[PDB]
Amino acid sequence: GALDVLQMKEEDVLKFLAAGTHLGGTNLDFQMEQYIYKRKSDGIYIINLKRTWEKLLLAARAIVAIENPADVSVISSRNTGQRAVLKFAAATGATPIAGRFTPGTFTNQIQAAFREPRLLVVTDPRADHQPLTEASYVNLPTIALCNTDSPLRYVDIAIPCNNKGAHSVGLMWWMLAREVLRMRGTISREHPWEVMPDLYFYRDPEEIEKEEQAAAEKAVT
Template identity: 30%
Template sequence: MSEQTESTDIKKKILSTGIRVGTPVKTKFMTPFITKASPEGLYMLDIDITLEKIKIAAKFINRLGTDKLIVCSARQYANTPIEKFCEMLGSKKLLGRFMPGTLTNPSLPYYIEPKLVLISDPQVDVQAITEATNAGIPVIGISNTDNITSKLDVIIPANNRGRKALATVYWLLVRQILIERGELKEDEPMKYEIDDFETKITEEEIE
């Protein structure tokens, strides 16, 4: 299968996941990644740029090593995607509140020295970004239309609020990392599908 048809297939597969649906707000940082506004007034992200940025992020992660990466998010919907990502790639996860000093205070028992940090939302994960920046650690961030991304080294423009969208971004990233490593062919199915990466909500949460 040629790369062209492959990328078309992937695009078809992910368009229904809401990955490119932004918010009613756009920042100057995210303007280059926005194509148009939807009839409902939501800014839409350019899916081609998203896929391109996922390739760049995958190369970057592979260069430094997935075992040197920490993936953090205080956003609940990112929990399952991050758990699956770390399970498949051997990265370290930090879910929930980011403890101050994690990257900057060597005297703390939970202090770590990663080579790279991946965050799910620049707004929610601001503590992780600040500490990584102070420690000179590069940051890859999944960013929506309303995010401020001045401290990020690689921006993955995507909907970082939706369950399905977050699952899709992490799924695409794992897939691309495995392809870059030569462990997965472009047209080969992965062990997990996007659904497996999705945080399931319980009935109590729906009510």
């Protein structure tokens, strides 16, 4: 997005820095090299957040270009991102796939699990190589949330933010949902979106098993 209204805001910068999403891995992929600002003394690559914003806006345009909101499918095989893709599907009307992706979903037309979408959106290429590979049999364009070391074999709209941190993954999914809903006539671009980005964060079972009881003690006291 080249427009002035389609520009990163200070609040967006603050969310990005708080969630990380600029601290890549110690490895660098030669096709991801163009999104890197500099390598720290830690060996951690710094990802250009402006380039990430532009790629995210391009992905949002690609997603909103589809008339049928169910024709875009969001997949996260890893646990850190299943909640994010479910909330993304709930927000945008997309079709979610979480956890184990059964092979042949896009190619074997016999079973009821078969589906043929018009766009693929992937949390991580290494974790979701199987849907990435299967999209190559059915003429399926792909957006994937790639890190500095993510292979880009079947990736078209690679967003260079992160794929490791739970906060980063939740934030990037929430940001993409916010952008597609603002591009459509859903949000007014003026007031902040009412959905907190914590709604998209993956929580570890040792937090699910203690947070609500801590809150229950605080509420009863």
